Amino acid sequence: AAQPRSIDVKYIGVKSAYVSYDVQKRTIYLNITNTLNITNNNYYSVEVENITAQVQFSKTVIGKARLNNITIIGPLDMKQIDYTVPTVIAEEMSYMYDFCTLISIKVHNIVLMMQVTVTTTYFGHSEQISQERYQYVDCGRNTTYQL
Ligand SMILES: *[C@@H]1O[C@H](CO)[C@@H](O)[C@H](O)[C@H]1NC(C)=O
Ligand SMILES: *[C@@H]1O[C@H](CO)[C@@H](O)[C@H](O)[C@H]1NC(C)=O
Ligand SMILES: *[C@@H]1O[C@H](CO)[C@@H](O)[C@H](O)[C@H]1NC(C)=O
Ligand SMILES: *[C@@H]1O[C@H](CO)[C@@H](O)[C@H](O)[C@H]1NC(C)=O
């Protein structure tokens, strides 16, 4: 059991996603709630200084969120962390309005690029853990979640 074992960050997926459309500005409003698994396999507490995440589409950042003072994670513990990222697809990518409001197809799946960076500090050292994962989202309807 050799320490310091680095924090373990697993990107789960999209728990919920609510969509709104503005006809006149030809924009999609896309609120994505992501779930994050953070595991501490050390026998000492470690604190998660902050989390910064950004939603990307067509190689273009469409949304961003910042979380501060997440929580202290005790020894051998893990925390499930949900964070919501409001995103907007408009202007240069306004063609997505037509596709996402397309009637001839019943489901409208697009691929978003999720980026997240978790900064943890232990014993006066700051470690940084980042991930990039591609994630499916349905931009043609809400994706809800009810326990
Ligand atoms: C999506 O997020 C924006 C900004 O946070 C908010 O104004 C809007 O009401 C949200 N829509 C839904 C359906 O939650
Ligand atoms: C994330 O953590 C929860 C809580 O322990 C667990 O049930 C779930 O399987 C984890 N997700 C993955 C993809 O392992
Ligand atoms: C996150 O926390 C670190 C350490 O406290 C700080 O230096 C940094 O400015 C914060 N924000 C980002 C985006 O790293
Ligand atoms: C579900 O999507 C529709 C699309 O027009 C939107 O009007 C509605 O607000 C969404 N649901 C919620 C709870 O926001």
Author numbering: 115 to 261
Task: Copy text from the publication.
To enable biochemical and structural studies, we produced the luminal portion of human TMEM106B (residues 118–274, designated TMEM106BLD) by overexpression in human cells. The protein crystallized following partial deglycosylation by endoglycosidase H, and the structure was refined to 2.6 Å resolution. The final model spanning TMEM106B residues 118–261 revealed a compact fibronectin type III (Fn3) domain, an ubiquitous 7-bladed β sandwich fold, closely related to immunoglobulin domains. In TMEM106B, the domain is crowned by a short α helix (α1, residues 208–216), which is inserted into a loop between the canonical Fn3 β strands 5 and 6 and stabilized by a disulfide bond between Cys214 and Cys253. Endoglycosidase H cleaves N-linked glycans within the chitobiose core, leaving N-acetyl-D-glucosamine (NAG) attached to the protein. Concordantly, four NAG residues were found in the structure, linked to TMEM106B Asn residues 145, 151, 164, and 256. The N-terminal portion of the protein, not present in the crystallized construct, comprises a cytoplasmic tail (residues 1–96) and a single-pass transmembrane region (residues 97–117). To further confirm that the spike-TMEM106B interaction is required for SARS-CoV-2 infection, we used our structural data to identify six putative spike-binding residues in TMEM106B, mutated each residue to alanine, and tested whether these TMEM106B mutants still supported SARS-CoV-2 infection. Substitutions M210A and F213A had the most pronounced effect on virus infectivity.
